[PDB]
C-alpha cells in the first residue's frame, strides 16, 4: 500500500504536467485560428488592391499609347 | 485502515484521467501542426499577393512618368 501512495504521487505530477501542456496547446490552437483569420482578412485587402492597381495600370497604358501617337513615337 | 479502497480506486480514476488527457494532448498537437501548415501556405499566398502589388505599383510609376514625359513633349 505504501508504493501506491508513491505510484500515485508520481502519477499526480504526470497528470499535472500533461494537463498544463494540454492547456498550452488549447491556447495555441486558439491563437492559430485567429491568425489564419487575420491572413484571410489581409489577403482580401491585397486582392482588392491588386484589382484597383490593375485598372490604373490598364488606364495608364491607354493614355501612354494615345499620347505616343499624338507625338509620333514608336 | 480500510481507507485503502478509497485511494486504491482514486488511483484507478487517475490512471484513466491521465490516459485521456494524453490522448487529447496528442490530438491537439496534431491539429496544431495542421493549422500551422495551413497558416504557412496562406502566408505564402499573401506574400505573392504582395509581390504582385509592388510590381504593379512599379509599372504604374514608370507609366505615370511616361505620361508626364509625353505631355511635356507635346507642350514643347
Curated annotation (Swiss-Prot), chain A:
Leucine-zipper as annotated region, ranges: 46-67
Domain remark in the UniProt entry: Residues 89 to 100 and 106 to 125 define the N-terminal activation domain (NTAD) and the central acidic activation domain (CAAD) respectively, which can function independently to promote high-level transcription of the target genes.
Induction: Translation is induced by amino acid or purine starvation, or during growth in low or poor carbon sources. Translational repression during nutrient-rich conditions is dependent on four uORFs (upstream open reading frames) present in the 5'-UTR of the mRNA; these promote ribosome dissociation. Translational induction occurs in conditions reducing translation machinery efficiency, leading to ribosomes scanning over the uORFs, and increased translation of the mRNA. The rapid translational induction is followed by transcriptional induction at later time-points, independently of the uORF sequences.
Encoding gene per record: GCN4
Post-translational modification: Phosphorylated by the cyclin-CDK PCL5-PHO85.
Top-rank taxon: Eukaryota
Membership in a protein family: Belongs to the bZIP family. GCN4 subfamily.
Parent-record interval covered: 250 to 281 of 281
Protein name according to UniProt: General control transcription factor GCN4
Function: Master transcriptional regulator that mediates the response to amino acid starvation. Binds variations of the DNA sequence 5'-ATGA[CG]TCAT-3' in canonical nucleosome-depleted 5'-positioned promoters, and also within coding sequences and 3' non-coding regions. During nutrient starvation (low or poor amino acid, carbon or purine sources), it activates genes required for amino acid biosynthesis and transport, autophagy, cofactor biosynthesis and transport, mitochondrial transport, and additional downstream transcription factors.
Summary of subunit composition and partner proteins: Homodimer. Each subunit binds overlapping and non-identical half-sites that flank the central CG base-pair in the pseudo-palindromic motif 5'-ATGA[CG]TCAT-3'. Interacts with the mediator tail; the interaction with GAL11/MED15 is direct. Interacts with the SAGA histone acetyltransferase complex. Interacts with the SWI/SNF chromatin remodeling complex.
Record's subcellular location: Nucleus
Phenotype reported upon loss of the gene: Abolishes recruitment of the mediator complex to the upstream activating sequence (UAS) of amino-acid starvation responsive genes. Decreases RNA level of genes involved in amino acid biosynthesis and cofactor biosynthesis during amino acid starvation or methyl methanesulfonate stress. Growth dependent on amino acid supplementation. Sensitive to amino acid starvation. Sensitive to purine starvation. Decreases cellular glycogen levels during glucose starvation.
Amino acid at each position: 500500500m505504501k508504493e501506491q501512495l508513491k505510484q500515485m504521487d508520481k502519477m499526480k505530477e504526470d497528470l499535472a504536467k500533461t494537463e498544463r501542456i494540454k492547456k498550452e496547446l488549447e491556447e495555441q490552437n486558439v491563437t492559430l485560428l485567429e491568425q489564419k483569420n487575420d491572413l484571410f482578412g489581409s489577403m482580401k485587402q491585397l486582392e482588392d488592391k491588386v484589382e484597383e492597381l490593375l485598372s490604373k495600370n490598364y488606364h495608364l497604358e491607354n493614355e501612354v499609347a494615345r499620347l505616343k501617337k499624338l507625338v509620333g513615337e514608336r
